[PDB]
Amino acid sequence: AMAEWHKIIEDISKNNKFEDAAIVDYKTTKNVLAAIPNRTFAKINPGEVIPLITNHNILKPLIGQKFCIVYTNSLMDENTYAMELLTGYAPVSPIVIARTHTALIFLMGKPTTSRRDVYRTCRDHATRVRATGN
């Protein structure tokens, strides 16, 4: 599974619609498993993961030490496994977090990228990974 996390990031990186991405464990150590280098999501720490998976009412989470704003949250639902946010700083950009059996996939679009494209791209990656048991 470790190599595959990097393959997912590589695939995202080739697409000019996205600005940032990371895959972070949520089961055990909560370390960053793969990330686009030298951007915000590479800095996600365990204390940022726990509120996302625990607090039903999370609204202004810190992600890589910057605030984001939650506008839909079905992250812990087994059928949807996705949350939608906006950055809480300029330029306002769309974010989707999708949940596999063991990891969170964070994806940020450029400001011009549609909500649909970020959602479908992030969630489809999670759908594929879930089929492997990860």
Question: Is there a contact between 36 and 24 (Cβ–Cβ < 8 Å)?
Answer: no
Q: Which helix (H) or strand (E) holds 19?
A: strand 18-25
Q: Sign (positive/negative) of CA torsion 52, 3, 111, 101?
A: negative
Q: Provide the 8-state DSSP code for 40.
A: S
Beta bridge partners of 95: 85, 108
Q: Which domains does the chain have, with CATH numbers?
A: 1-134 (3.30.450.30)
Please tell me what resolution, in angstroms, this structure has: 1.5
Can you say whether residue 21 is alpha, beta or left, with left for phi > 0 and alpha for psi between -120 and 50 degrees?
beta
Question: Cα–Cα distance between 8 and 76 in angstroms, integer?
Answer: 22
Question: Cα–Cα distance between 84 and 1 in angstroms, integer?
Answer: 25
Per DSSP, helices labelled H in 1-134 are 2-13, 46-54, 115-131
Q: Sign (positive/negative) of CA torsion 46, 10, 126, 118?
A: positive
Q: Which helix (H) or strand (E) holds 105?
A: strand 103-109
Residue 133's Cβ-count burial label (10 Å; 0-12, 13-18, 19+) is: exposed
Question: Cα–Cα distance between 67 and 83 in angstroms, integer?
Answer: 15
Residue 51's Cβ-count burial label (10 Å; 0-12, 13-18, 19+) is: middle
List the Cα angle 71/74/80 in 5-degree steps. 130
- Tell me the technique behind this structure: X-ray
Question: Cα–Cα distance between 66 and 114 in angstroms, integer?
Answer: 22
